[PDB]
Write a protein that binds this ligand. Structure first.
Ligand SMILES: O=C(O)[C@H](CO)OP(=O)(O)O
Ligand SMILES: O=[P-]([O-])[O-]
Lengths: 246, 246
């Protein structure tokens, strides 16, 4: 599988901080045919970020609308993303499910709209602390993945992300071994639902706390194909996280 | 009061269509010291739009986060807007109340963040067909305005918009006089919750259907200080709607 390292800048940045951060990223010599490196700035920072990053970096946005063009004040359609050659979208991030009540059906509709417009999708899911302590991790992830997985018609163009919500902001820690087991089962669902080749092709990223210290322990696991990185991707040392995939 | 004519492009535009439309808008000679004219493109179109419009046109975005900077994937904070010199935000548009379940409390929180970060805000509210048919227009608008109105300190920098939801896709039609009656009531609510001077300063825009054939009849009404214009603002003839306020 081609490894995939993504920077989710979330709701952070200034014009000047992005100028310095993108300059630092550009100093890393990597081959984009060997690994994908994608930066997801805030929507209003996209043009600045895409201009400042060298062409080896891919870019995307952090959300996309389930509606197409029309009377949807504040939304960005997949059609507008296509017209701007915004290559990737994040869908289903836990912060959208938590604060903006995004549902599995919304994730399905956004994936559908994205694929129809030739956008590549980074689709997020994962179980809560209570679900995990109830031994419901596989029931929860299965339902979340089955909400959308039958739409995938090209297994390079959809990238899955496991978010261990039980170990985000809970004072709990996931280990590489724990993450590897969930990733194996995610790949088993894709297998079940879409077939063995397709399952062995798709990228499944880890979306819990990634930093320069733990990144290699994660990506060296057999079924962990890269990361969706949050706060560590706002630092110049994010290049060392990319190096773990090189 | 200075009149205020705003283009809510909603979720519409291509880079090419915006190049043509902004060129047509730039041909209109008007004096921005006498009239505010504000364009609200989609977030990922903002940079292109602001570079293409002469500064006589003010610009803004169609939504803003209720949260500040941080782990809010997909949101745009008021701090980020301010660093980009985005001048205006729309808050509380009925489409966000409808499709994204934005509440009065969300509107308040977005307004507080916006004003904290020295943005100007276009704040929308209005009653449904059922509410009007139950004779609850004033009760409903009083509650919607009182959810946020105490946050306003500079009554030039918050602009209210009445959206007659009862006449939007209902087959019902608001006459300019019916609009005027609600605008006068909104101004009375501001007078009694804030003060007389405050109420006489604040702009109250009509946010129902505005086109080249009705704009003159609306802006002549005493308590109508401009418009938040939808589909008609995607047309070159929007310049004639601007002229009606000149
Ligand atoms: O990966 C995301 O996009 C996350 C959600 O937590 O951020 P972090 O890497 O800091 O945990
Ligand atoms: O966009 P509205 O005036 O129909």
């Amino acid at each position: 599988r081609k490894y995939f390292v993504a920077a989710n800048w979330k709701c952070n940045g200034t014009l000047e901080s992005i100028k310095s951060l993108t300059n630092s990223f550009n100093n890393l010599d990597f081959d984009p045919s060997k690994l994908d490196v994608v930066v997801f700035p805030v929507s209003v920072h996209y043009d600045h970020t895409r201009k400042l990053l060298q062409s080896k970096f891919s870019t995307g946005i952090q959300n996309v609308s389930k509606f197409g063009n029309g009377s949807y004040t504040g939304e960005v359609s997949a059609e507008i993303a296509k017209d701007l050659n915004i290559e990737y979208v994040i869908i289903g991030h836990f912060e959208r499910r938590k604060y903006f009540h995004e549902t599995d059906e919304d994730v399905r509709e956004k994936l559908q709209a994205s694929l129809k417009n030739n956008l590549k999708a980074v689709v997020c899911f994962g179980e809560s602390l209570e679900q995990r302590e109830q031994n419901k991790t596989i029931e929860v992830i299965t339902k979340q993945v089955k909400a959308f997985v039958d739409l995938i018609d090209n297994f390079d163009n959809v990238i899955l992300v496991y978010e261990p919500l039980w170990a985000i902001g809970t004072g709990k820690t996931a280990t590489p071994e724990q993450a590897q087991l969930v990733h194996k089962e995610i790949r088993k669902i894709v297998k079940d639902t879409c077939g063995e080749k397709q399952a062995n092709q798709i990228r499944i990223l880890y979306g819990g706390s990634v930093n320069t210290e733990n990144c290699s322990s994660l990506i060296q696991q057999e079924d962990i194909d890269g990361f969706l990185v949050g706060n560590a991707s706002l630092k110049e040392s994010f290049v060392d996280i990319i190096k773990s995939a090189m």
